[PDB]
Amino acid sequence: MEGKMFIGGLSWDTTKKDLKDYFSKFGEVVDCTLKLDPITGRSRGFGFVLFKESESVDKVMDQKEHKLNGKVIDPKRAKAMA
Amino acid sequence: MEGKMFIGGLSWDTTKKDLKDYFSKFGEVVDCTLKLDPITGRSRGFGFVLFKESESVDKVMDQKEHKLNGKVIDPKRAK
């Protein structure tokens, strides 16, 4: 089954391509997004990743250190969202 | 803050103590229960867990899968 993640802490200069390239380290990424302010475009500071295989989510969680564009980021399982 | 969870999908043989023992690995459990039908007293096949610290709920939700008595169970935030 596909596996979905919420990604917090994304730097303001992070692009969708940045996000896709990074999480491709863990397997095939079906899609990924930044969440944008619909009015200003200010990076809300988080994004989402949709993996082809949910085992990829396990591999992300297994790895302790995630950094992207010089900022520590925080991948979470979708089910963990409040 | 405390953290309250709904625990779905419990096996018929799961006890209150099973719940306490299993979820205690994520942090202190204040209490936990097997829910019963308020009229018939019949098992509802799910339970509740009250963690002393809400952090424990986050730890539970970081885990790939939860298995108890051979069965995959389904912890949810109580809301």
Numbering used by the authors:
A (entry chain B): 76 to 157
B (entry chain A): 76 to 154
What does the published report state?
We obtained the AUF1-p37RRMs protein by RNase treatment and determined the high resolution crystal structure of AUF1-RRM1. A selected AUF1-p37RRMs crystal was diffracted to a resolution of 1.7 Å and belonged to space group P212121. Consequently, we produced selenomethionine-substituted crystals using similar conditions and experimental SAD phasing succeeded using the AutoSol pipeline in the Phenix program. However, after refinement we realized that the two models of RRMs were identical because they had the same sequences as RRM1. The monomeric RRM1 molecule shows a typical RRM structure that contains αβ sandwich with a βαββαβ topology. The PISA analysis, based on the calculated interface area of 374.2 Å2 for the two RRM1 molecules, indicates that the arrangement of RRM1 dimer is most likely generated by crystallographic packing. The two RRM1 molecules are easily superimposed with a root-mean-square deviation (RMSD) of 1.80 Å for 79  Cα, except for the loops β2β3 (L1) and α2β4 (L2). Taken together, these results suggest that the linker between the RRM1 and RRM2 AUF1-p372RRMs proteins was cleaved by a certain protease, possibly a serine protease, and the free RRM1 fragment was specifically crystallized 1 or 2 days later. Although we only obtained the AUF1-RRM1 structure, it is still possible to compare the structure with other tandem RRM structures such as HuR and hnRNP A1, because two molecules of AUF1-RRM1 are found in the asymmetric unit.
Heterogeneous nuclear ribonucleoprotein D0 (hnRNP D0), also known as AU-rich element RNA-binding protein 1 (AUF1), is a well-characterized ARE-binding factor that destabilizes mRNA, while human (Hu) antigen proteins of the ELAV (embryonic lethal, abnormal vision) family are known to stabilize mRNA. AUF1 has four isoforms, p37, p40, p42, and p45, generated by alternative splicing. AUF1 contains two tandem RRMs and an adjacent Q-rich motif. Many proteins regulate mRNA stability by interacting with the AU-rich elements (AREs) in the 3′-untranslated regions (3′-UTRs) of mRNAs.
